Design a protein around this ligand. Structure first.
Ligand SMILES: Cc1cc2nc(N)n(CCCCC(=O)O)c2cc1C
Lengths: 226, 216
């Protein structure tokens, strides 16, 4: 039951430094090689580096050989990545990954991956999103299904999380990938389909969360009155 | 500068056999490159599939296999299933560092599904901000190729809309798309008919959803 949980992501200033960490469980951490990988917007995966069990062997992607430092603490089942001299090119999702290292069979696989921690390098300030309702353009009388949602716009940086009815409603939900508007602010939509006949009886609330700005919003979406 | 290349997208039918390739810009891919493959499922969920060019990782169905074909490393999937829809990444060891390929999006063919279209007028709360966002939703369709045209009082819009598309759905293999038309409260108030016209293989003729500003 391998678990890799990253933390330390967020908004950073160009030229600054940042330290990401990773908690591991479900396996004998002390016996495995660990790896960091990142993925920038519109790009593929990029290997950052690795570190063997006893920390005596550490390999880096040529470029970052000296702007990144990888370390680990076996006693605390933790992996660390120190980023420095940050530039916009460093904005990306950083992943904590386990490497199954078998020199006998010359078998090397990045088997388990964490879900990543987001990092954004910019001189701009954080901003909470405004949450607007996408009202059901249907009446509880029309019968059938109806579509409704939430418009989460003008926030920075990524990401925001969206859930409906504190997680109770997950079927038929579609949360779209955020888009970068010209203003330099992000925006996204989350929609869900519910029975028309439940409109007026069932409460639909979208829970928006934006950590970078410690913003939490719960907007109730109802059919606009005429 | 080692560059690893993969085809950007491939489509196969259920039950069919498909092969994804991985090529090195420095020459033929060899055993010392220890080609490895990673699968990416929606929500950034990655899993290692193949190691050492042709060795399956534990828990990986035998329908997946790797090998060297020509000068490239390859991943072959036999009897493709809808659960195989994902993005596959290849990676080669380059003596002292690893290099990933750009990834290949594997789509599994399924029957055509026309989208359910919905249009959403901007809320009054947002209007107070001086901006107006009009949203159009295209729900659960296939294939992905879809055209969305905005019309304001019958005038085709351009440069003022952005769209987003979800990843192929794990269950029904469909896509969902959202188009957002952004206007200033000023311009928004200067017009009456806001329409979203959709063209898709599953529609004999384009579908239009609209509303008149103010009407309710
Ligand atoms: C994903 C991956 C990670 C790796 N990390 C190291 N250090 N090697 C090289 C193997 C050791 C070199 C040797 O002993 O010859 C890797 C090969 C692959 C495919």
């Amino acid at each position: 039951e391998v678990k890799l949980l990253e933390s330390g992501g967020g908004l950073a200033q160009p030229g600054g430094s940042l330290k990401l960490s990773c908690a591991a469980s479900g396996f004998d951490f002390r016996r495995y090689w660990m790896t960091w990988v990142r993925q920038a917007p519109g790009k593929g995966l990029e290997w950052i580096g690795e570190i063997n069990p006893d920390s005596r062997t550490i390999n880096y992607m040529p470029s970052l050989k000296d702007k990144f430092i990888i370390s680990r603490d076996n006693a605390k089942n933790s992996l660390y990545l120190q980023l420095s001299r940050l530039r916009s090119e460093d904005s990306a999702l950083y992943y904590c990954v386990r490497l199954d290292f078998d020199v006998y069979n010359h078998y090397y696989v990045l088997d388990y991956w964490g879900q990543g921690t987001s990092v954004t390098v910019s001189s701009a300030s954080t901003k909470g999103p405004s949450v607007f309702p996408l009202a059901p353009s249907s009446k509880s009388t029309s019968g059938g299904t109806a579509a409704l949602g939430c418009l989460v716009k003008d926030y920075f940086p990524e990401p925001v999380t969206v859930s409906w009815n504190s997680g109770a409603l997950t079927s038929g939900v579609h949360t779209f990938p955020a888009v970068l508007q010209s203003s330099g602010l992000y925006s996204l939509s989350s929609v869900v389909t519910v029975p028309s006949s439940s409109l007026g009886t069932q409460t639909y609330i979208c829970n928006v969360n934006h950590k970078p700005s410690n913003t939490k919003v719960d907007k109730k979406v109802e059919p606009k009155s005429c | 500068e080692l560059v690893v290349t993969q085809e950007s997208a491939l489509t196969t039918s259920p039950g069919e056999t498909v092969t994804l390739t991985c090529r090195s810009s420095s020459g033929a891919v060899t055993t010392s490159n220890y080609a490895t493959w990673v699968q990416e499922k929606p929500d950034h969920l990655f899993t290692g599939l193949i190691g050492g060019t042709n060795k399956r990782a534990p828990g990986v169905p035998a329908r997946f296999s790797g090998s060297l074909i020509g000068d490239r490393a390859a991943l072959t999937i036999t009897g493709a299933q809808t659960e195989d829809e994902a993005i596959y990444f290849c990676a080669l060891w380059n003596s002292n560092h690893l290099v990933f390929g750009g990834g290949t999006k594997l789509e599994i063919k399924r029957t055509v599904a026309a989208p359910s279209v919905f249009i959403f007028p901007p809320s009054d709360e947002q209007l107070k901000s001086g901006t107006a966002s009009v949203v159009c939703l295209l729900n659960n369709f296939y294939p992905r190729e879809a055209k969305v045209q905005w019309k304001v009082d019958n005038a085709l819009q351009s440069g003022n809309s952005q769209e987003s598309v979800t990843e192929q759905d794990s269950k029904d293999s469909t896509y969902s798309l959202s188009s957002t038309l952004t206007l200033s409260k000023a311009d928004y108030e200067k017009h009456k008919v806001y329409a979203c016209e959709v063209t898709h293989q599953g529609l004999s003729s384009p579908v239009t959803k609209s509303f008149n500003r103010g009407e309710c």
